Design a protein around this ligand. Structure first.
Ligand SMILES: [Ca+2]
Ligand SMILES: [Ca+2]
Ligand SMILES: [Cl-]
Ligand SMILES: [Cl-]
Ligand SMILES: [Cl-]
Ligand SMILES: [Cl-]
Lengths: 97, 97
């Protein structure tokens, strides 16, 4: 039918929008999880005595980005915002099971 | 120093591994969130009277994937596994704030 076709088209367009985003999140989450064990190391290094001492050494090349005033600060911020977004999503997904 | 260099190298290698995975998850989560409002539509369509009726019509071309026995079933499974993984991650991230 002409009308059955309309229903199917709408559903296919909906699936095509949503399904790749579901897939990409699953993939990204799995990759993140294999390395999240390293986060405390980086968080704890930023603003530590050693980080500051190293940042203020007279390097003969451009210092590593980890030694900058802002790079790991921004990483911590991105982490904390992600934590909040994951916390907010969790019960919403549970509701859709 | 030779040794200060060792500390910095280790931290830089750690950051280079972790930081892109954090970024990719943030990006994937944001994209998913803009379309998660469509999930109930697709979930509810699968195994519905209309879905089954449409799947059993005599289409003159290959039926749309949404009409298959397995495609949306697998999407629901992927969703439910993701829900559980997000629920498990949420308190772990809170602990690292
Ligand atoms: Ca396509
Ligand atoms: Ca590189
Ligand atoms: Cl690991
Ligand atoms: Cl490790
Ligand atoms: Cl939307
Ligand atoms: Cl919408």
């Amino acid at each position: 039918m002409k009308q059955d076709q309309l229903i199917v088209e709408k559903m296919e367009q909906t699936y095509e929008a949503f399904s790749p985003k579901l897939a990409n999140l699953i993939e990204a989450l799995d990759a993140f999880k294999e390395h999240y064990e390293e986060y405390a190391t980086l968080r704890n290094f930023y603003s530590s005595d050693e980080w500051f001492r190293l940042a203020n050494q007279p390097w003969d090349d451009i210092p590593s980005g980890v030694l900058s005033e802002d790079l790991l600060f921004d990483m911590i911020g991105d982490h904390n915002q992600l934590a909040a977004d994951i916390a907010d999503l969790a019960p919403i997904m549970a509701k859709h099971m």
